[PDB]
């Protein structure tokens, strides 16, 4: 059901310091090859007082390229899909929290977001709007129980540093699970190379378009 070119639905809800917004979007990418596109538009709560930044890695990881002796238990749990949550901590002390769903249904995923972003300083560089897009990431993966249930699914570790406009960078640890919504066989440990970059925007961020190429390898 996973074929060499795949679209996705995106909508996100979410709030950071209390700034309520959604957002919806499409893509488009290459599963096998590990790349992919979306273009997003704030259809409420626009312009965001908050850098995008800390959005656009929750717009996709169906799209990783995995060489055939890593399993793709992400790809593998589909039709059903699969589910994931995540916390990111923030060096100055912001916290986003996300829940994600992904299913397919006629014949593209569907990406449904829920975003807390909460203890963000009022004058930091997310609330003042002072980042420009994320260094390239490696996210450590490995089988464990990340929901507390006793049973294990697939687990991720990122130390993500997001650049300054003033210069230098704004580091956050990360940690997402990743649920299967059936059955499926469990890889393990690897790692994932990512860049995410922002390829266009209006004056406001209203509307953005980003690029994502991911990879896993071996340790
Ligand atoms: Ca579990």
């Given at each position: 059901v996973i074929k060499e070119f795949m679209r996705f ?22 599963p096998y ?29 169906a ?9 793709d238990?992400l790809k593998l749990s589909f039709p059903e899909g699969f ?19 992904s299913s397919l249904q006629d014949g593209e995923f569907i ?70 919504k059936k ?37």
């Amino acid at each position: 059901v996973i074929k060499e070119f795949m679209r996705f639905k995106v909508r996100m809800e979410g709030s950071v310091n209390g700034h309520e917004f959604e957002i919806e979007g499409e893509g488009e990418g290459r599963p096998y090859e590990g790349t992919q596109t979306a273009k997003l538009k704030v259809t409420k709560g626009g312009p965001l007082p908050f850098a995008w930044d800390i959005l656009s890695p929750q717009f996709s990881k169906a799209y990783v390229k995995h060489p055939a002796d890593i399993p793709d238990y992400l790809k593998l749990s589909f039709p059903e899909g699969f589910k994931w949550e995540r916390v990111m901590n923030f060096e100055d002390g912001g916290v986003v929290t996300v829940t994600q769903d992904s299913s397919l249904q006629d014949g593209e995923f569907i990406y449904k977001v829920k975003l807390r972003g909460t203890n963000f300083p009022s004058d930091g560089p997310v609330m003042q709007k002072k980042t420009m897009g994320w260094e390239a990431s490696t996210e450590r993966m490995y089988p464990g129980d990340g929901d507390g249930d006793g049973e294990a699914e697939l687990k991720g570790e990122i130390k993500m540093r997001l650049k300054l406009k003033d210069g230098g960078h704004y580091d956050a640890e990360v940690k997402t699970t990743y649920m299967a919504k059936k059955p499926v066989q469990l890889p393990g440990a690897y790692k994932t190379d990512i860049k995410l970059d922002i390829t266009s925007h209006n004056e406001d961020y209203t509307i953005v378009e980003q690029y994502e190429r991911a990879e896993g390898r071996h340790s």
